[PDB]
Design a protein around this ligand. Sequence first.
Ligand SMILES: O=C1CC=C(OC(F)F)C=N1
Ligand SMILES: [Zn+2]
Length: 140
Amino acid sequence: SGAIYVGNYRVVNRHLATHNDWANLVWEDSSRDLLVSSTTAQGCDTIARCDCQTGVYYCSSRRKHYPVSFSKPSLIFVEASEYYPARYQSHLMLAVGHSEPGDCGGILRCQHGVVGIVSTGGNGLVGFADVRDLLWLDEE
Ligand SMILES: O=C1CC=C(OC(F)F)C=N1
Ligand SMILES: [Zn+2]
């Protein structure tokens, strides 16, 4: 589990969105595994605006933050998980690291701020849904 809180936006894995998220929907994209809902209170997070390929992510299944190198966001085939069938997921970054389903929502951060959230795992990789292209998160 986990979210990004930027301005009056809450960014979650689409597959973990709650009824309240869907009732306060700003934007969602199944292909990206992302959903954004509106918040009443302002959030503590700053979104990275950059093309970093190194950062640190939180792994809940290890209670640990790991430094990683990661691929640039791309359209990637993802094997079946407990929460999606095998499918193509867009805007996904991969790193070598540990990820189980419940690790989804852990933050990946670089020197510029929040890069994305854990969205995939298995076979020794961790996949992160990028948010750095979502410029509208920073305004309005
Ligand atoms: O292997 C699967 C097939 C379908 C899924 O989607 C949904 F049923 F959770 C999840 N895992
Ligand atoms: Zn960066």
